[PDB]
Design a protein around this ligand. Sequence first.
Ligand code: CNC
Length: 241
Amino acid sequence: EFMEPKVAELKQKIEDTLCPFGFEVYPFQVAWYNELLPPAFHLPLPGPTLAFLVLSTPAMFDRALKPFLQSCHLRMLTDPVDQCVAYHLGRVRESLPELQIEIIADYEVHPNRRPKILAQTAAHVAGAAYYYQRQDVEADPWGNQRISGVCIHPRFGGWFAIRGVVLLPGIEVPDLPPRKPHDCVPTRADRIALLEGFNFHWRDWTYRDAVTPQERYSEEQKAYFSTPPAQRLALLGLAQP
Ligand code: CNC
């Protein structure tokens, strides 16, 4: 009846399940996501439907991936981190058994090769990380190249990843208050440098420092993500109990 207490209760339940393992949780309305998108990407839910954007902080690697590797057998052709994230998104269901919930991870792609969710658009409208796009630089320098956008977290910079959306059909919060993402890379020259670093130099990691981060990925975590996905899956499978 009154949704404000309901949103807080649901958020707290999801945070209790996910925050100990290195995730953060942000509510948004489905309408805010659909509003920005062409119909191919629309979530076919009523606009006031409550959703949650899930991202991983640097701590996810130690708090979730490492214990996961000790307890679960790795499947082929799926990155270990994606298997870990699928496991933890699955725990959200166990934590709300009396609700119909729908979960779409960042790694999910349609047979037509479109991603099932636009993770960066969800992160922006959930107020979690400003999504910096080519059109945020007027008269940008890149011409007729594809230039991908990039989200920057106000606490972690680019040292984070977007992991999924949790949708709660039937739970409608038309008055959920919009929380705008922090424009933490405001200047033109910094926006150009960020987009250049992400698009053409992302293997040197430096785009993630576009704001000073409270924490970075550990050198061990950086070793993992620096390793080609085929090799890291082969090596972790080799060493598993
Ligand atoms: C496919 C994909 C994806 N990738 Co890559 C990965 N892995 N990626 C790739 C590949 C191609 C990317 C591409 N084609 O653009 C490749 C090339 C495989 C790749 C590579 C990388 N990726 C990388 C990363 C980190 C990420 N990738 C994701 C973007 C990550 C995605 C995860 C996900 N599920 O979203 C991902 C699965 C889908 C991205 C996509 O297709 N978007 C392109 C297009 C469809 O979206 P768009 O450009 O934003 O356009 C929409 C918006 O503009 C929106 N819109 C319109 N008006 C507005 C107004 C506003 C205000 C807003 C907010 C939106 C809009 O509408 C448009 C659609 O019509 C990421 C969000 C995944 C994650 N966090 O788990 C993450 C970025 C995180 C961040 N800080 O933003 C890499 C560094 C490698 C890595 N470590 O994984 C590297 C970076 C180079 C690069 N060029 O991106």
